Design a protein around this ligand. Structure first.
Ligand code: CDL
Ligand code: PC1
Ligand code: 3PE
Ligand code: 3PE
Ligand code: 3PE
Ligand code: 3PE
Ligand code: PLC
Ligand code: SF4
Ligand code: SF4
Ligand code: ZN
Lengths: 46, 116, 154, 96, 95, 49, 176, 207, 114
């Protein structure tokens, strides 16, 4: 006796699948970005 | 009631002929501009005779509704030439320059094939 | 026409597992790029009333705030057994419509993840041999199945 | 098998060959005429006649679902053999 | 998958994500190109009894359109009940 | 250290094709100098890896 | 259910407003885009080395039509004309007559490979697995006339690709 | 339930029959026939003079609100006095329903343009003109849309041949693309497929 | 009772006085329907559904709860539909679709299959 065999998902189902937007956060704040930029100018002028 | 029908533009042949003539004047005055914009190899006289031939074919119509349609198609065919939506190939299709003459007499048709 | 070959659903799962990352990389190039926004924001604005009267459908409606999607309002097949969200725009311009299609790609990955897990067993065409052709094995042994194969294909 | 015409052009298994004065032969100048060398009428004539011990035998062409529709052949006449209408194989009843 | 550790670090930092976990090239997680033979099932109409075709003939149960009006106190009606309002998703209401 | 191993594999492709002459032959015919496991050869001379 | 894609209210505190001023003046999100292209510069490209490498296919692939034989050498086709009836492009032309031995066999079997839409209906209709679409997809020609196959060209293809055609049909006939 | 037979929805069949009567009571001047199919679709058949009244009522009435024109097309039946059957397919987002409105005309009788009611009808009516030759009165811009410039005839008419009357070609002598009568290297083959046995007795016609 | 910042539909502006605007329009519709014959079905039906929508407005001072009662989406959508009915009523007077059928179709105009 041979059982039926056709394409089926594995017992318990497949693992979870990510679908949501995941644009991460990087970099410093505006205050610190401006502080580093002005600091570079002051050293350059000196 | 059977012969009572809705008109398209003209209620009788007398008004229809007015539209036919206005259309003919439009085509007559456009040939020189057409023969120039498309750089055709025909002359203006040849162009204006083709318009005459096309109008002559439908000279036996006595239905005002039919005449209205022929004018509607003529005005459509005219708007394509003025605005250069056609191309030199489309304009020259009225002349059949690449089709060999086909005989009109019985004997010649007999020699070549079976068509009447 | 045919049933899925063995092993295809596993390969669909491996593809779907990584696709959401591909969309994110696409959004790192377009969504916040100021040059992209300038080309698509407040360009081609459609009012919710002009869209209906001009015959629009799909994201041309959903971009202008009209809440309409045939998959949810007039469902067909088994679209009423899956969960997804319909993106909706607010300004009805090119940028909002670009966000609706990017977000609809994510909701498709959500539907696909449910089709792979809720795929039932059975046959793959209606078991009425006056519409769908019989199996080739039974078309070569049974007289009715040969008659119905002959007539359906001629 | 393939036999050549008096003009040197091969004859196909359907019997096709251009006559000597047929202008259509010019298509083969500097080229060739595609002819399949395995004549099916000769190949099936080499197959031995299968001896069976029943009035009626069945043929499916071999391979089961990979053959042809299954047909039953009557072997009551000893003057000739039973031939399958699909694959051309022949069957004969053993001395009865 | 053959990228050195340094280049793996450089690519991950540049994109801001962990690319090595979701490579867009397939190596060994794919199905074998040779598979065991299947044995597909059969439909509900594969029976030896109680299976007459007149009891499952869909095409023969179609009927011509019913005529409600033809030229040859009543409460107003609409084609269907008004469509119910949609609900914001608790999954992610705002993108 | 891993930089060193990359160069070692780059050199072992030269030896894996039969020296410089074989290495250059597959660089101009195939535009690729990878080394694989021979799977077999057909009667016309093609080699499969 | 539905969700809004572009209905956010940006904050108006000083830190948030300064964050967008740094983004406007220092081009932060543009340089974030340069980094993504930099990452792809160090990823292995997906290009394959054709013609020495080939793109993967499956046993169901539909390529060059062909005519098969039985293991005895007899042709499988019996001129039933089901394929000619089902071909949506009318790319098949057939003529048949009794053979010298009385068999039902074709005397013409042409496929116009420029009318053909490579759809596979011819091989679904065939009751004897005679006309199949093989796995060959590299058969481009230099003239239009070489793509008008006749029975001799189709039988040559079958003899030429039988080793691969039979193995594919072995791998898929359980799904048909 | 029967696994192979499409299920019936008697609720939607009763609601669409009520609304069909509702429409015919409000426009007796135009409605000639209302029918509901066995798969729950509603057809309102009207005199061609009511194209604007009937459509305007269905778009603007508070219980109809058919604000979207799904499609507009024509069907050619050579055996009728009025060959052409004009079909309007409409949609209602408020009540989530569809409705079909049909009228008729012939080669010479015009029909009123629907652009005032539906701006979507602008291109559909050009397509009906181009392919069937039905003139729409008061159309802002009526002309061929799909066929080639200078094309003669209306190709979707049942009597227009499948392969047309002319075919194009490049002629080296005149250095342009020419039009010539059509000759086919292989004639289209005509199959007589209909079986001589009745398929559906439910649709049998009186003899 | 807070006013809404947006209707969500492009080109549809928020209305600060939904109750006042609807009473005017519904009253205007009922006054236009008075010029239509008494027996015409368009008048009988439109009055039936206009009054019950006008009674819902005059018995529900909350906008959010009013929308649930009317079942017409945003209150601005219900105002837009009132303006469409008013325009429709003004056009039915000129068309007079309550008259008998203009003409019968030919004998087999709606027969299918032929
Ligand atoms: C300036 C940038 C530094 C240049 C040096 C490149 C380098 O050494 O990369 C090593 C290493 C390999 O890069 P990968 O991202 O890991 O990808 C290759 C795989 O790891 C491993 O891939 P693989 O196993 O296939 O490596 C085999 C490869 C051998 O690998 C290499 O050839 C890399 C070295 C090239 C230099 O064999 C070859 O194909 C040799 C072809 C050589 C063609 C390029 C010749 C460049 C010479 C300069 C031009 C002179 C004219 O990358 C680094 O570590 C860079 C850090 C230093 C900067
Ligand atoms: C081969 C060698 C490899 C190294 C080559 C250099 C790499 C340069 C590209 C790397 C990009 C990495 C992506 C990244 O982290 O940026 C995101 C980050 C953050 O992106 P963000 O937009 O999300 O930041 C959010 C914070 N606020 C709101 C304040 C912006 O971008 C930056 O911080 C860059 C700011 C400095 C840019 C200054 C440019 C001025 C011109 C200087 C001339 C020199
Ligand atoms: C240009 C180089 C861009 C760069 O390298 O910045 C990327 C870096 C990302 O670092 P990350 O790990 O994502 O920080 C996450 C912390 N939450 O982002 C950062 O860490 C921010 C560090 C740099 C901040 C910008 C400095 C001010 C910019 C204006 C001055 C730039 C010109 C200075 C003179 C250059 C001459 C060399
Ligand atoms: C709201 C605030 C807006 C910003 C206000 C201005 C910010 C402060 C000034 C910085 C901006 C101007 C740029 C000046 C560049 C000077 C570079 C530097 O900082 O180097 C300091 C340097 C140290 O001394 P040094 O000479 O190097 O010692 C070795 C001697 N053997 O010494 C020097 O470099 C020389 C000294 C230069 C002094 C010039 C600035 C004086 C301006 C008056 C000070 C008050 C600031 C202005 C207030 C009004 C603003 C509206
Ligand atoms: C300069 C040109 C590159 C020369 C090579 C630098 C040294 C290469 C190396 O091996 O270290 C690079 C380092 C990788 O280390 P990391 O990715 O952080 O650890 C992961 C462990 N699986 O990458 C780094 O993190 C170092 C930079 C920080
Ligand atoms: C400086 C850092 C401190 C600061 O910016 O103030 C923070 C303070 C608190 O934040 P918040 O509660 O949001 O107040 C804003 C409400 N109007 O926010 C404040 O209220 C501070 C006062 C707000 C008004 C300041 C306007 C700043 C912008 C002026 C232009 C600055 C130009 C600097 C040069 C740019 C080129 C680098
Ligand atoms: C050639 C001379 C030019 C530089 C001159 C010195 C500039 C001083 C700036 C101080 C502000 C600051 O934050 O700078 C130091 C920063 C680190 O930022 P943080 O304080 O941790 O950020 C805190 C705020 N968050 C949480 C929003 C990020 O350092 C860096 O990673 C940048 C390179 C130095
Ligand atoms: S693949 Fe389709 S179109 Fe091509 S010959 Fe076969 S049946 Fe005809
Ligand atoms: S369907 Fe098969 S057997 Fe029939 S004519 Fe075509 S190739 Fe021959
Ligand atoms: Zn056999």
């Amino acid at each position: 006796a041979s059982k039926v065999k056709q394409d089926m998902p594995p017992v318990g189902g497949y693992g979870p699948i990510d679908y949501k937007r995941n644009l991460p956060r990087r970099g410093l704040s505006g205050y610190s970005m401006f502080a580093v930029g002005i600091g570079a100018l002051l050293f350059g002028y000196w | 009631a059977s012969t009572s029908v809705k008109p398209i533009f003209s209620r009788d042949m007398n008004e229809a002929k007015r539209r036919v003539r206005e259309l003919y004047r439009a085509w007559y005055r456009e040939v020189p501009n057409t023969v120039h914009l498309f750089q055709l190899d025909i002359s203006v006289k040849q162009g204006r005779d083709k318009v005459r031939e096309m109008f002559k074919k439908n000279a036996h119509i006595t239905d005002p509704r039919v005449v209205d349609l022929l004018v509607i198609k003529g005005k459509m065919e005219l708007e394509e030439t003025i605005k250069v939506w056609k191309q030199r190939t489309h304009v020259m299709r009225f002349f059949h320059e690449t089709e060999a003459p086909r005989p009109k007499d019985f004997l010649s048709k007999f020699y070549v094939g079976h068509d009447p | 026409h045919q049933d899925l070959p063995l092993g295809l659903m596993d390969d669909i799962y491996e593809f779907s597992k990584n696709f959401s990352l591909r969309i994110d990389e696409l959004e790192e190039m377009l969504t916040n790029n100021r040059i992209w926004r300038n080309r698509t924001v407040d360009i081609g604005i459609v009012t919710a009333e002009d869209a209906l009267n001009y015959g629009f459908s799909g994201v041309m409606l959903r971009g202008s705030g009209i809440q309409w999607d045939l998959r949810k309002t007039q469902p067909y097949d088994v679209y009423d057994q899956v969960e997804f969200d319909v993106p909706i725009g607010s300004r009805g311009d090119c940028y909002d419509r670009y966000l609706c299609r990017v977000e609809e790609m994510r909701q498709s990955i959500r539907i696909i993840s449910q089709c792979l897990n809720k795929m039932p067993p059975g046959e793959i065409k209606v078991d009425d041999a006056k519409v769908s052709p019989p199996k080739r094995a039974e078309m070569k042994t049974s007289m009715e199945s040969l008659i119905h194969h002959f007539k359906l294909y001629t | 098998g393939v036999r050549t015409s008096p003009t040197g052009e091969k004859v196909t298994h359907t019997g096709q060959v251009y006559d000597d004065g047929d202008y259509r032969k010019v298509r083969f100048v500097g080229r060739q005429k595609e002819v399949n060398e395995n004549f099916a009428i000769d190949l099936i004539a080499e197959q031995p006649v299968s001896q069976v011990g029943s009035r009626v035998i069945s043929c499916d062409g071999g391979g089961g679902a990979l053959g042809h529709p299954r047909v039953y052949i009557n072997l009551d006449k000893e003057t000739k053999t039973g031939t399958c209408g699909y694959c051309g194989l022949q069957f004969r009843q053993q001395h009865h | 998958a053959s990228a050195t550790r340094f280049i793996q670090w450089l690519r991950n930092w540049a994109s801001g994500r962990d690319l090595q976990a979701k490579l867009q090239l397939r190596y060994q997680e794919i199905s074998k190109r040779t598979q065991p033979p299947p044995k597909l099932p059969v439909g509900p109409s594969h029976k030896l009894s109680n299976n007459y075709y007149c009891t499952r003939d869909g095409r023969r149960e179609a009927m011509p359109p019913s005529i409600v009006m033809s030229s040859q106190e009543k409460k107003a009606v609409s084609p269907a009940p008004p469509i119910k309002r949609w609900e914001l998703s608790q999954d992610e209401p705002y993108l | 250290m891993e930089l060193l191993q990359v160069l070692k594999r780059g050199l072992q492709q030269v030896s894996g094709h039969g020296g410089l002459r074989g290495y250059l032959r597959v660089l101009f015919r195939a535009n690729d100098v990878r080394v694989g496991t021979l799977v077999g050869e057909d009667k016309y001379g093609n080699k499969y890896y | 259910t539905y969700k809004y894609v572009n209905l956010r209210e940006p904050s108006m505190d000083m830190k948030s407003v300064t964050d967008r001023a740094a983004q406007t003046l220092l081009w932060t999100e543009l340089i974030r885009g340069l980094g993504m292209t930099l990452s792809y510069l160090f990823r292995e490209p997906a290009t394959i080395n054709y013609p020495f490498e080939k793109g993967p296919l499956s046993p169901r692939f539909r390529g060059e039509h062909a005519l098969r034989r039985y293991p005895s050498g007899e042709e499988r086709c019996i001129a039933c004309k089901l394929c000619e009836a089902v071909c949506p492009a009318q790319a098949i032309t057939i003529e048949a007559e009794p053979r010298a031995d009385g068999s039902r066999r074709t005397t013409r079997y042409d496929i116009d490979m420029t009318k053909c839409i490579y759809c596979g209906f011819c091989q679904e209709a065939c009751p004897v697995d005679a006309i199949v679409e093989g796995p060959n997809f590299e058969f481009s020609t230099e003239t239009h006339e070489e793509l008008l196959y006749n029975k001799e060209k189709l039988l040559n293809n079958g003899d030429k690709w039988e080793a691969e055609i039979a193995a594919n049909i072995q791998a898929d006939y359980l799904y048909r | 339930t029967r696994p192979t037979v499409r299920p019936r929805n008697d609720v939607a069949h009763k609601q669409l029959s009520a609304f069909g009567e509702y429409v015919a009571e409000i426009l007796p001047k135009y409605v000639q026939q209302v029918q509901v199919s066995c798969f729950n679709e509603l057809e309102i058949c009207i005199h061609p003079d009511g194209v604007i009244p009937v459509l305007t009522f269905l778009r603007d009435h508070s219980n109809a609100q058919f604000k979207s024109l799904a499609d507009l097309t024509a069907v050619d039946i050579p055996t009728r006095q009025n060959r052409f059957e004009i079909v309007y397919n409409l949609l209602s987002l408020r009540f989530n329903s569809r409705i079909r409105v049909k009228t008729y005309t012939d080669e010479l009788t015009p029909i009123e343009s629907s652009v005032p009611v539906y701006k979507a009808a602008n291109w559909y009516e050009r397509e009906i003109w181009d392919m069937f030759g039905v003139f729409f009165a008061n159309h802002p811009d009526l002309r061929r849309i799909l066929t080639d410039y200078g094309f003669e005839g209306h190709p979707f008419r049942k009597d227009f041949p499948l392969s047309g009357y002319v075919e194009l070609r490049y002629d080296d002598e005149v250095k342009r693309v020419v039009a010539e009568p059509v000759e086919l290297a292989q004639e289209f083959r005509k199959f007589d497929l209909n079986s001589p046995w009745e398929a559906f007795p439910a649709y049998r016609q009186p003899p | 009772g807070l006013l809404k910042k947006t209707t969500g539909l492009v080109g549809l502006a928020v209305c600060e006085t939904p109750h006042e605007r609807l009473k005017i329009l519904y009253t205007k519709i009922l006054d236009v329907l008075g010029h239509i014959p008494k027996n015409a079905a368009y008048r009988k039906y439109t009055e039936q559904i206009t009054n019950e929508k006008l009674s819902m407005v005059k018995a529900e001072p909350d906008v959010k709860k009013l929308e649930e009662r009317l079942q017409g989406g945003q209150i601005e959508e219900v105002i837009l539909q009132a303006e469409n009915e008013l325009s429709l009523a003004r056009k039915m007077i000129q068309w007079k679709p309550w008259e008998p059928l203009v003409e019968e179709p030919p004998a087999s105009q709606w027969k299918w299959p032929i």
